[PDB]
């Protein structure tokens, strides 16, 4: 009572109804480093100009 | 200051675009006019210096020196239209271009409100000068003289540059005011000693220095007359002006690490004055004479005494005006005899009566007899040195000996005595020469009435 599978069906991407739950982290990843805080605030003008030696502005 | 800096620049487009023969006349009259404007800075309050802006500020030291520069510019321009009128207009116009630029750097340097700002143009005066000696000089050794002058002052300027930026990285801005108010006692650590040398050797190599004075005979004697005044009248004060400005963050390391420099200057001036007593070239005698007076200034700064600075400023400006006038004296003969040997042209009083007189009070003013501010300059330093050490007067006064012998010896050899038989080129003194020289000595005598202006910041 079987049947020869034609081309394609055996290569079909098929789902499977399982029991085992999704692993929490298969790669066994560790805790991430905290990213450095990003810049915030209105870009105010530079205080007292270039401030490079005697250059006033 | 913008009331002076902008007009000084404005001559440059004017001179470059003036008529063919109006170059000297137009440039001179506005140059005199600018000096009149620069007379405005003589006023100084009993307190903090006149701070016009963050870009520029003038004190009771810069202003007397500033006016000397502005009053000087007519004097080279009026001293140079005789040995250059035979050249083309463009080269003559280029000569004014160097001189005007040379002044502009001096005006900005003496008025710089920032120490590093001082450093750039104070060093940048080399470029206009180096052109003057090398291009328009009138001898072969001028080229080696140019290398001698340029390298000798650059060897000290660079360590100052590293020192100044280091003070920036350790104390913030080097504004003259904030430096004075934010002062830290310098420790006797070895690094501070080397920092002391860097901040001092650049200025001390610049006046003369005994050991570092070898460039003056090369430069001053070989330089063109318009330049030759500047290498002795004002730029020597740049090395001076730096000293009193920089010796406020070095205390008390200057109290101890000054004996080798004080000892070199005190004994050195006796040596170099003795050189004048046995010199052969008229210009070299004058240049070496400038060494002895300038070495006296070097001594004066290194005690850090109110009387010492008080006569230090007076000596510099008094010496600068004189040394220029004596260099005018060398030029006057130089056009006629076409040589610089002293004994070649003896006997000028009989031929040129008034020029002999102009050589007379010029010599007395170099003699530093009272009340001429040369005396008020030296005499103030004597007391400051005497309070520092009583033996100083033995070395102090012995210089007054030599400066007396060679000063008249230059006078007696040239003016007095029998006139040279084989010369027949000496003509009557041009009214340009006599008028120029009167414009030297007369303000110098006029300053004697109130040397309160020239006394300096300590007063
Ligand atoms: C009352 C007033 C009467 C008239 C006074 C006229 C002037 C006078 O004699 O004053 C006496 C007074 C004397 O002060 P006094 O305290 O005796 O008071 C005078 C008033 N009586 C007489 C009634 C007591 O001194 C001065 O005013 C000082 C004058 C100094 C002049 C200096 C001129 C220098 C010129 C330089 C030209 C070149 C500049 C460029 C180069 C600079 C150097 C590098």
Give dist(CA B434, CA B228) in Å, integer: 19
Task: Say if the Cβ atoms of A54 and B55 lie within 8 Å.
Answer: yes
CB neighbour list of residue B71: distance below 8 Å, 6 or more residues apart: B35, B38, B443
Ligand 1: which of B4, B376, B449 to mutate, judged by most atoms within 8 Å of the beta carbon?
B449
Paired tokens of B132? 């003057």
Angle of CA points B64, B67, B72, to nearest 5°: 130
Contacts of B132 (CB under 8 A, 6+ apart): B95, B98, B99, B102, B223, B224, B226, B227, B230
Q: Which residue has the tokens 């400051």?
A: B384
User: What is the rounded distance in angstroms from the CA atom of residue A11 to the CA atom of residue B402?
Assistant: 115
Q: Are B63 and B56 in contact (CB under 8 A)?
A: no
Beta bridge partners of B281: B341
Tell me which of B446, B452, B453, B456 to substitute to probe ligand 1's pocket, judged by most ligand atoms within 8 Å of the beta carbon.
B446
**Ligand 1 close to Cβ of residue B452 (< 6 A):** no
Asked if B431 and B306 count as a contact pair (C-beta separation under 8 A), the reply is no
On whether any CB of chain A is under 8 Å from the CB of B164, the answer is no
Beta bridge partners of B112: B56
The H-assigned helical ranges of B249-391 are 253-256, 259-276, 282-301, 306-337, 353-367, 373-388
Answer whether B65's CB lies under 8 Å from B237's CB: yes
Residue B116 to residue A53, Cβ atoms within 8 A: yes
Question: Resolution of this PDB entry, in A?
Answer: 3.6
Chain A nearest-CA residue for B169: A53
Closest Cα of chain B to A45: distance in Å? Answer: 20
3-state secondary structure of B112: strand
In terms of Cα–Cα distance, which of B129, B130, B110 is closest to B121? Answer: B110
**Tokens at B30, concatenated:** 């506005």
Task: Give the DSSP letter string of B174-194.
Answer: -BHHHHHHS--PPP--HHHHH
Question: What φ, ψ does residue B137 adopt, rounded to 5°?
Answer: -65, 160
Whether B168 has its CB under 8 Å from any CB of chain A: the answer is: yes
* Alpha carbon of A44: minimum distance to chain B alpha carbons (Å): 23
Q: Is B317 in the pocket of ligand 1 (CB under 6 A)?
A: yes
Distance CA B322, CA B363 (A): 9
The answer to whether the CB of B390 falls within 8 A of the CB of B309 is no
Q: Which residues contact B135 (CB under 8 A, 6 or more apart)?
A: none
CB contact B179 to A (< 8 Å): no
- Nearest-angstrom CA–CA distance, B373 and B347: 30
Query: Chain A neighbours among B 17-76 (CB < 8 Å)?
Result: 54-55
- d(CA B250, CA B236) in angstroms, rounded, equals 22
Asked whether the beta carbons of B113 and B176 are under 8 A apart, the reply is yes
C-alpha Rg value of chain A to the nearest Å? 31
Q: Does B117 contact A53 at a Cβ distance shorter than 8 Å?
A: yes
- The answer to whether the bond into A21 is cis (omega within 30° of 0) is no
B105 within 8 A of B124, measured Cβ to Cβ: yes
Burial grade of A27 (CB within 10 A; 0-12, 13-18, 19 or more): exposed
Specify the experimental method. cryo-EM
Instruction: Please check whether residue B171 touches A, CB under 8 A.
Output: no
B104 Cβ neighbours under 8 A, 6+ residues apart:
B5, B8, B9
């Amino acid at each position: 009572g079987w049947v020869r599978p034609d081309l394609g069906e055996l290569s079909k991407v098929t789902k499977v109804k399982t029991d085992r739950p999704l692993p929490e982290n298969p790669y066994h990843s560790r805790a991430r480093p905290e990213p450095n805080p990003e810049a915030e605030g209105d870009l105010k003008p530079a205080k007292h100009g270039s401030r490079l030696f005697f250059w006033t502005m | 200051m913008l009331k002076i800096i902008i007009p000084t620049t404005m001559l440059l487009p004017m001179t470059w675009m003036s008529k063919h023969n109006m170059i000297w006349i137009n440039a001179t009259v506005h140059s005199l006019l600018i000096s009149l404007i620069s007379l405005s800075l003589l006023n100084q309050l009993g307190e903090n210096s006149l701070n016009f802006s963050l870009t520029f500020f003038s004190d009771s030291l810069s202003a007397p020196l500033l006016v000397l520069t502005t009053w000087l510019l007519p004097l080279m321009l009026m001293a140079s239209q005789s040995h250059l009128s035979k050249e083309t207009t463009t080269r003559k116009k280029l000569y004014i271009t160097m001189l005007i630029l040379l002044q502009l750097f001096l005006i900005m340097t003496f008025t710089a409100t920032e120490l590093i700002l001082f450093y750039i143009l104070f060093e940048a005066t080399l470029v206009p000068t180096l052109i003057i000696i090398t291009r328009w000089g009138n001898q072969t050794e001028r080229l080696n003289a140019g290398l001698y002058f340029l390298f000798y002052t650059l060897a000290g300027s660079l360590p100052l540059l590293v020192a100044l930026v280091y003070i920036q990285n350790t104390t913030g801005s080097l504004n003259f005011l904030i430096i004075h108010y934010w002062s830290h006692p310098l420790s006797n650590s070895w690094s501070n000693i080397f920092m002391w040398l860097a901040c001092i050797m650049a200025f001390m190599v610049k006046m003369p220095l005994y050991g570092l004075h070898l460039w003056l005979p090369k430069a001053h004697v070989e330089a063109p007359i318009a330049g030759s005044m500047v290498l002795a009248a004002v730029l020597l004060k740049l090395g001076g002006y730096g000293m009193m400005r920089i010796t406020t963050i070095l205390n008390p390391l200057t109290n101890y690490m000054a004996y080798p420099f004080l000892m070199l200057s005190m004994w050195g001036m006796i040596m170099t004055s003795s050189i004048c007593l046995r010199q052969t070239d008229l210009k070299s005698l004058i240049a070496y004479s400038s060494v002895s007076h300038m070495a006296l200034v070097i001594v004066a700064i290194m005690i850090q005494t109110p009387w010492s600075f008080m006569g230090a400023t007076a000596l510099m400006i008094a010496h600068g005006l004189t040394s220029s006038m004596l260099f005018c004296l060398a030029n006057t003969n130089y056009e006629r005899v076409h040589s610089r040997t002293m004994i070649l042209a003896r006997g000028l009083q009989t031929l040129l009566p008034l020029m002999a007189t102009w050589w007379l009070m010029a010599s007395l003013t170099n003699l530093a007899l009272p009340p001429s501010i040369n005396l008020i300059g030296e005499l103030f330093i004597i007391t400051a040195s005497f309070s520092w050490s009583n033996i100083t007067i033995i070395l102090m006064g012995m210089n007054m000996m030599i400066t007396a012998l060679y000063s008249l010896y230059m006078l007696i050899t040239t003016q007095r005595g029998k006139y040279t038989h084989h010369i027949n080129n000496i003509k009557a003194s041009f009214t340009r020469e006599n008028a120029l020289m009167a414009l030297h000595i007369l303000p110098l005598l006029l300053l004697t009435l109130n040397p309160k202006m020239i006394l300096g910041p300590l007063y």
